[PDB]
Amino acid sequence: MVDFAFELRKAQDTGKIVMGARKSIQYAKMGGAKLIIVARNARPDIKEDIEYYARLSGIPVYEFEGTSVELGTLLGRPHTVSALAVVDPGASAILALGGKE
């Protein structure tokens, strides 16, 4: 399976990720995101909007099985991260989280 923590950090280190719900929605809307990752406990209203804008734009969403505290810690951030957009996967296999289509 895709090693989420590794591939996510490798995309951070070698590609471009944009952090947060607001950026995730923005990049979904203008089609700049390749993949959106959302924390399972993203606040429900925000999550719904992320999921809508992604579906609108045909951007895959992958639900991190972890909290926004865990996701932010994974990304080396001192704050929660409820979602992010993969703008450039770099050298990583992060986009494979999106499925084969």
Numbering used by the authors: 0 to 100
Could you pull the original sentences from the published paper?
For example, we have shown that the thermophilic ribosomal protein L30e from Thermococcus celer has a ΔCp value of ∼5 kJ mol−1 K−1, which is much smaller than the value of ∼10 kJ mol−1 K−1 obtained for the mesophilic L30e from yeast. To study the contribution of charge-charge interactions to the thermostability and the reduced ΔCp of thermophilic proteins, our group had systematically removed 26 surface charges on T. celer L30e by single charge-to-alanine substitutions. We used the double-mutant cycle to investigate the effect of pair-wise interaction of two salt bridges (E6/R92 and E62/K46) on protein thermostability and ΔCp. Since thermophilic proteins tend to have more salt-bridges than their mesophilic homologs, our observation that salt-bridge reduces ΔCp may provide a general mechanism for enhancing thermostability - thermophilic proteins have more stabilizing salt-bridges that reduce the ΔCp, leading to the up-shifting and broadening of the protein stability curve.
As a negative control, we have also used double-mutant cycles to study the pair-wise interaction between E90 and R92, which have a long separation distance of 10.8 Å. The crystal structures of the E6A/R92A, K46A/E62A, and E90A/R92A variants were determined at resolution ranging from 1.8 to 2.0 Å. The structures of all these variants can be superimposable with the wild-type structures. The root-mean-square deviations (r.m.s.d.) between Cα atoms of the wild-type L30e and its variants were <0.5 Å, suggesting there were no major structural change in these variants. In contrast, the values of ΔΔGint were close to zero for the control pairs (E90/R92). The average values of ΔΔGint for the salt-bridges E6/R92 and E62/K46 were 2.3±0.3 and 3.9±0.3, respectively, while the value for the control pair was 0.6±0.3 kJ mol−1. On the other hand, for the E90A substitution that did not break any salt-bridge, there was no significant change in the value of ΔCp. On the other hand, for E90A substitution that did not break any salt-bridge, the ΔCp value was 4.0±0.1 kJ mol−1 K−1, which was similar to that of wild-type L30e. The values of ΔΔCp(int) for the control cycle, E90A/R92A(M), were close to zero (−0.1 to −0.3 kJ mol−1 K−1). In contrast, the ΔΔCp(int) was close to zero for the control cycle E90A/R92A (−0.2±0.4 kJ mol−1 K−1).
